[PDB]
Assembly symmetry: D2
Homo-oligomer: 248 residues x 4
């Protein structure tokens, strides 16, 4: 019986790379998406071409709301329905945009704190409640202590996610559920970002003056879920090419 | 003219100790409170007896909601209404209770209270404080020295306090150009919960290397007063542990 | 042709497990040792029986002194002499014992504890870099408990904190040369041979994930990840392998 | 009776400002120096003009060596011989220069950089505590806010400063039962090197969010004064950044 993984925000970019690598390793996968239905199904189609009935999609908004807990319960339920088990949860989905101190602000709070922290918390609860090499991997941020200017809410969300990673590692250890993070520095740059701004970031990276591929981020995820990480819990692995070590 | 400070959750315990010490230092104070009206008014009375028209109370729920931004804005407005300025903001108010991951309040409410009080309200209050502004403007966030060795089953509380570290850093960076410093004070064990039995209190006390006792409220307030003072005018983005070595002690 | 790795303090325990796993992955290995000559030679024998001419021993005291730079250069030299290349350095050797603030002299304690845990890693890093399709990296055996240290282990703890600093500074400075520098930070793994069983069990019961210490092989697994092609964007990172021990309050 | 403090490397710059502020606070002081005899004596004479018999100087090399333990014991002993007590130790003296990994002997660089920044502090701490085997005893270590984002090619310096963090934590834990608190102050950019061109000084100044300027020596001293004060008596194992937010600024 193959293990099964849920990957949030898995239609594109880093989440897609993670889904693909888990699938290549032998997992059956739930590809969660919010707006990217076409891309989510295209990925499922590709994975199911390789191995029939090993990939399904699941739609949900992960914005904080009165219905978020039910939405997160259903994401976990979708894995059990499709595959009869849920071994791995990857909290990858994330809103990312500036929120200057000086969309309504309450909506920004709901999206940024919801996707990056509250949904991971609720998914973690539902994952644990429903329960071998069980683990959770949270996509963190190597730059949390040297944050982007005017990204307070995003940064708060990513700090909260560090807190969840630690608290859940502690509390779920008795159940044999490990809880770890992967912290990219600069990986795939935002599609909306200009080419000049992208190159400004790349030239800051000590190791090769380039961003991490999605696959390089996924490699750390694969390690953490693997049998080679069986004693590792509450750890956050930076995958940042030394970017966080570089002073102003 | 005397400077003015807002202290959230200032009716009792650490919040009161901070309000009292700021007042003793020459600040006029807004004593924010949620449910503790009697205690808030009693404190304001004591302070106004010491110096007339130097303390007012301000009631607000800091639970997350769509009106929280308006509530936070009104807290800062109340300081300007009373005193014509707002030099210091102390984010002290905090919900604190367990939220077990594996099994009264709905999870939605728990998220709203624990994340709202510890992180979102601080953020909105920070926004409003900055938007309203020789000078010594600053914000102090009451953090938690144990955030990396958290209490079992307190994930949402811990998440909120981590978020608060993030705000302290992000806001220090962004508000520096406005001369608004943003720092934190991180108690370990200070005043134990009223509902806690003495045996459980003593268990915590005997963990603290420096004197096997909890921090007094005044000791926490002392670090706050330092950070708002002219003796800290180059300090921003710093979180000062006031924990008697507790966070250094392994399992 | 096969890459080559230096592992310090490789004759026994975690260093041996690291040497063995690297060897199983395809590395030729320099098994550095100080006092454990018989165990070092026995391991080299086992590894060479598996693949001929893939293991050598190299003896060196890694206590701080005016000759330590020469000793460290000679360790790296021994890898080039045996194998013609040096792809991986694992800084594992370590003195570990209490040095209370209130038989060995204090100058010897400083020399041993700071030398093995920090200065030798530095000098080995220098010599490794100076001697340099490729995948060059250094892995430093750190300590997950550096911020919640054992009582009366100040010099040891200072050494391990210095090793964190080295890992970071060297990651930064050697990145332009394609040399990655990372760490692995055990919590409780193989307990000291001298420790009494009661105290061993005390430590085991503190670990959230399984109430047991890490095996040497579990520590080695993280080293193998960091030197692998699956870590080629990772530098300046220290991976805790502690079963959650460092998360547990007093 | 007046308390007494030892300040290492106190002839100039930050150490001098610390010595002055301690003296202004009421401390008698041991002004340790290595090469700067004239500056040390000039300070001593200035302080003794203020209050007779309140300042002495103590010469020592704090490079790592076989004799360093004796030298450190003698520094502490000097404070007892001068003043009959030793309440405060400030580990400020520090060698600082690049040590590139790829191309003074290296063993000398090790001895100087690790000796001054880590081993001498450790030995001074041992000696301080052994002599202590109303009171407010404490140690303040001058750390570095940039230890996790170090200058390129300063590995041995950075190693020494990381080691000093370890000492600060380990000694806080171990000495807490004796009532001796151990803390740090971590400047980011404070007084720039004397030779440094203003154009290079400005490159660093412009990076500092809070005021685009370096910390004065006096601002660093202010944080030391807080930590040794009665307002910090629950604070141990804490390192206070005094960096204007520099360490929060990404590349
Ligand atoms: N890229 C980087 O350089 C970098 C750096 C540091 C950390 N990270 C972290 O690594 C992870 C992946 O990064 P990425 O750049 O690949 O992420 P991304 O493209 O910004 O977002 C990934 C997905 O998150 C989903 N998402 C956004 N808002 C959502 C909402 N309200 N509800 C449900 N899903 C929502 C979206 O799914 P749909 O498209 O289906 O709507 C989106 O495709 C994130 O956690 C990110 O913070 C990335
Ligand atoms: N006590 C400790 O040992 C300790 C340890 C570490 C950190 N800290 C931190 O230091 C600060 C002070 O601690 P403390 O023990 O004095 O705090 P506390 O007694 O638990 O709470 C302080 C005040 O928070 C206010 N509050 C709670 N929920 C609120 C809501 N929904 N809306 C508005 N206000 C709300 C309450 O005001 P009303 O009474 O008016 O309802 C309460 O009096 C907190 O931030 C805490 O996290 C304390
Ligand atoms: N074991 C744990 O629970 C644990 C926890 C945290 C971190 N770590 C770290 O992980 C690494 C491996 O731990 P371990 O317990 O396997 O180490 P260990 O047994 O204490 O020491 C490994 C080797 O270090 C060598 N060594 C000691 N002093 C030396 C000197 N003066 N010169 C040269 N070599 C010297 C010894 O080699 P010879 O036998 O040949 O003399 C010894 O076998 C160490 O860096 C340790 O600090 C271990
Ligand atoms: N300045 C900054 O921007 C900055 C930034 C971060 C941290 N810090 C830290 O704050 C502290 C003060 O900084 P600073 O710039 O004022 O220091 P500094 O001028 O570089 O050095 C202070 C003193 O250290 C003494 N010293 C150097 N080598 C010694 C040796 N081998 N033995 C004994 N004493 C020796 C010297 O004494 P003599 O002159 O008598 O020879 C020197 O005057 C240091 O610990 C430093 O690392 C400073
Ligand atoms: C100002 O825009 C910036 C500045 C710095 C950046 O890396 C240091 C990036 C990379 C993209 C990114 C980082 S977290 C993150 N999180 C999500 N959910 N998506 C992303 N695309 C990113 C973008
Ligand atoms: C299980 O109850 C515990 C466990 C550990 C504790 O300190 C190490 C405390 C002290 C009270 C407390 C800490 S954060 C905090 N935050 C608020 N808003 N209120 C409080 N009363 C506390 C209580
Ligand atoms: C009081 O003795 C202790 C206390 C705590 C411990 O783990 C948390 C250990 C495990 C052995 C150990 C840790 S670093 C270390 N370093 C070396 N070179 N060797 C070792 N054997 C160890 C022993
Ligand atoms: C290349 O020169 C540099 C680069 C960056 C710097 O600040 C971040 C400084 C300030 C001086 C300094 C920092 S630690 C330090 N330590 C000692 N013992 N002395 C100093 N003078 C300094 C100088």
């Amino acid at each position: 019986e193959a293990p099964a993984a849920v990957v949030t925000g898995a239609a594109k970019r880093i989440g897609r790379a993670i889904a693909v690598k888990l699938h290549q390793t032998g997992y059956r996968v739930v590809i969660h998406y919010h707006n990217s239905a076409e891309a989510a199904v295209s990925l499922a189609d590709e994975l199911n071409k390789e191995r029939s009935n090993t990939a399904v999609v699941c739609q949900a908004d992960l914005t904080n709301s009165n219905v978020l807990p039910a939405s997160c319960e259903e994401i976990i339920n979708s894995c059990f329905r499709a595959f009869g088990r849920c071994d791995v949860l990857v909290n990858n989905a994330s809103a990312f945009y500036p929120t200057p101190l000086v969309k309504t602000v309450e909506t920004q709070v709901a999206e940024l704190i919801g996707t990056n922290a509250i949904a991971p918390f609720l998914l973690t609860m539902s994952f644990a409640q429903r329960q071998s090499n069980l683990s959770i991997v949270n996509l963190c941020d190597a730059m949390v202590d040297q944050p982007c200017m005017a990204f307070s809410l995003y940064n708060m969300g990513k700090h909260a996610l560090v807190g969840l990673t630690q608290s859940a590692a502690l509390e779920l250890a008795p159940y044999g559920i490990r809880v770890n993070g992967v912290a990219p520095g600069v990986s795939l740059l935002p599609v909306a970002m200009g080419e000049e701004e992208k190159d400004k970031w790349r030239r800051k990276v000590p190791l090769g003056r380039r961003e991490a591929s999605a696959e390089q981020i996924a490699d750390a995820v694969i390690f953490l879920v693997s049998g080679s990480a069986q004693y590792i819990t509450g750890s956050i692995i930076k995958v940042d090419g030394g970017l966080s070590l570089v002073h102003a």
